[PDB]
Design a protein around this ligand. Sequence first.
Ligand SMILES: NC(=O)c1ccc[n+]([C@@H]2O[C@H](COP(=O)([O-])OP(=O)(O)OC[C@H]3O[C@@H](n4cnc5c(N)ncnc54)[C@H](OP(=O)(O)O)[C@@H]3O)[C@@H](O)[C@H]2O)c1
Ligand SMILES: NC(=O)c1ccc[n+]([C@@H]2O[C@H](COP(=O)([O-])OP(=O)(O)OC[C@H]3O[C@@H](n4cnc5c(N)ncnc54)[C@H](OP(=O)(O)O)[C@@H]3O)[C@@H](O)[C@H]2O)c1
Lengths: 338, 335
Amino acid sequence: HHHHSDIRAVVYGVGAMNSIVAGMLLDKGVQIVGAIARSPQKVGQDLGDLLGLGRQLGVAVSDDAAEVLEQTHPDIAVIAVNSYLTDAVEQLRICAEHGVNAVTLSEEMLYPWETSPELSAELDALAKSTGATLTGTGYQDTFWVNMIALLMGTAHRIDTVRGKASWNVDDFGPELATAQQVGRTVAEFDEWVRGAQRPPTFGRNVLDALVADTGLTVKSITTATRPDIASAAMRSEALGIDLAPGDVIGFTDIDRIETEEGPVFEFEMSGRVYGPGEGDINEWTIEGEPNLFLSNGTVPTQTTTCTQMVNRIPDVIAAPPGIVTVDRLPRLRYRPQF
Amino acid sequence: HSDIRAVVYGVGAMNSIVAGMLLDKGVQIVGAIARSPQKVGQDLGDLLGLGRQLGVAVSDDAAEVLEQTHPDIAVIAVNSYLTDAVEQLRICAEHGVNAVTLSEEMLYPWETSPELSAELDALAKSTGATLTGTGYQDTFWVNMIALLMGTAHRIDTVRGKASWNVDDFGPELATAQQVGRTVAEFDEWVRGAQRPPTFGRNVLDALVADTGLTVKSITTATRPDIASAAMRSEALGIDLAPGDVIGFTDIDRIETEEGPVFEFEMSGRVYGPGEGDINEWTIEGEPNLFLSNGTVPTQTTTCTQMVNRIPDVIAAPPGIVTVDRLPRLRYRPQF
Ligand SMILES: NC(=O)c1ccc[n+]([C@@H]2O[C@H](COP(=O)([O-])OP(=O)(O)OC[C@H]3O[C@@H](n4cnc5c(N)ncnc54)[C@H](OP(=O)(O)O)[C@@H]3O)[C@@H](O)[C@H]2O)c1
Ligand SMILES: NC(=O)c1ccc[n+]([C@@H]2O[C@H](COP(=O)([O-])OP(=O)(O)OC[C@H]3O[C@@H](n4cnc5c(N)ncnc54)[C@H](OP(=O)(O)O)[C@@H]3O)[C@@H](O)[C@H]2O)c1
């Protein structure tokens, strides 16, 4: 039933991901009571019209997050706006100040304690003072953290945990495409990647979560990034731009954490514009006793980004106040209704 | 070194591997139970070829070993079906001893053996003991599949396909898989009124119960796996002729009132050279999902999962506690 759930939600950002999320919230019976955007064209429009549902929702998109929360006091803010706590702290402060629970796609919020310790401590204290839970989730929740820790649970001895992942820029919106340096020159890329304040890699937060969940001690952290290059003329649907042979179309990171206790963790991740025939991958190997393998074939990264944030909403409402990371939440479960 | 004091109940193919893993985790082996007169009185360390004696003499008297050692946990690798396993599980529950077992039916026995399940659950609760079926299925057929299901918006069908090798395991399992029988002997056996429940039926009962759904329909079928060429079974030390039964393949299906359908095909047979174990699962719905574990190490992860479960089973409430209800399985270098 359309609004069968007690849960009242604000959709914070209305981009590629929250457009999908909004439709899934309605399918679960969640009541959408508010919607926050930045583009002037979008403010004032009905969310239902803006998402191209044949029904109006009776929700007018606002450009004023604090005003929407003060007017609606939702159970949950569902955030798909940015990646790094340096940016995301602005939206997460507004949620926590108003005692509003927040689930966010911010990749750094997956496990932010090590990469952004000051902002993490600040947000955790604020959220605790107002009874609110803040949780970073998305694709990584199952496919790079909880399913990998579960696979590790079948090992007697672990020497190395190795992950390899590929996702398509053109499955996502301009925020991520621009952050992946799509359409930049190699010279622009080299200045950016060497920059003093380059954000932490998505994979660093993944490995911090696995190391912390396993209860191990960091001995050494290393990282490297190279641009992904167009081999021929391509187009980015995410930015609506032509890409010439030699243009940057994304990048590949490799992150590595050695533990004092012996296990080594390594994760290579490419986020780039795909040409025809390319597909996402999720491939993990454990070297030890025994050797283990996990693959998810052409893994639906885009859809499971959105399903995981949605299926987390009851967990995040029910969880203790503060920053609660997905390794500490109960097992993610299939729920037709909320 | 661990506080955990364990009795290794059965000393066959799987408990021989398990014993060495228990020692690696720092678990104290305080007793060992066998059936064979040949094994009784031997030091467990000698019997397993550890190259140190353990100071533990194998006994054929389970009750006596439990009364004498009062272990935290009995680690059972003896048999599969509650009809058999109730004998060892009664001795553990009577003595208030926690038990982790490889018994495949104990993965989720409530529907296939409701009377024996109720009896054992009541007895274990009266003495403060936890009884838990685990092994290979725990992660690869139940908990990892329920986790994958957690990423679906809508599920139409959950479909599994699994292969394991009889010759990775001991005579108990090889004999129960009808290895070396004729097709006519197999057809009489498989049609029998008291044929035990399929391993896969217990898998699907667990997934359906974990998802909180309602059974509408249960179907099952079995066919023998046939030698296409001359083979040998190392498990039974027998030559197998073209046309001989070398194991069997089950297909189990549960339709739910709510819509989702579960299906699981499992083959347990003697392998020829080049064959490998498989674990391949598909979820049809929104979205479509896939999981594969390559040439999955079924033999090693049978033993690692029972070992890695021991802290969970000690800490769990008394009664039959199924692995879908336990906290997430975790890697622990030391117990
Ligand atoms: N964890 C994961 O697996 C995962 C997966 C996919 C994406 N993400 C992350 O989620 C974020 C969003 O991705 P996307 O594909 O949806 O990008 P997108 O299409 O660019 O959407 C971003 C949205 O944020 C809005 N916005 C920007 N600043 C805002 C503010 N101060 N207040 C309210 N709204 C604001 C934009 O508004 P307008 O529409 O009005 O411009 C836009 O709707 C990115 O950082 C991406 O990296 C994470
Ligand atoms: N859940 C799973 O993933 C999984 C995986 C592998 C195996 N299993 C099951 O685990 C069981 C054992 O497998 P295995 O490969 O280790 O078989 P195995 O080598 O035949 O070992 C069976 C053991 O049971 C012992 N035994 C029989 N009756 C006994 C009793 N009353 N008290 C104490 N010991 C007794 C036998 O002792 P003697 O040697 O002294 O005759 C033998 O050592 C089989 O039922 C198999 O189906 C389950």
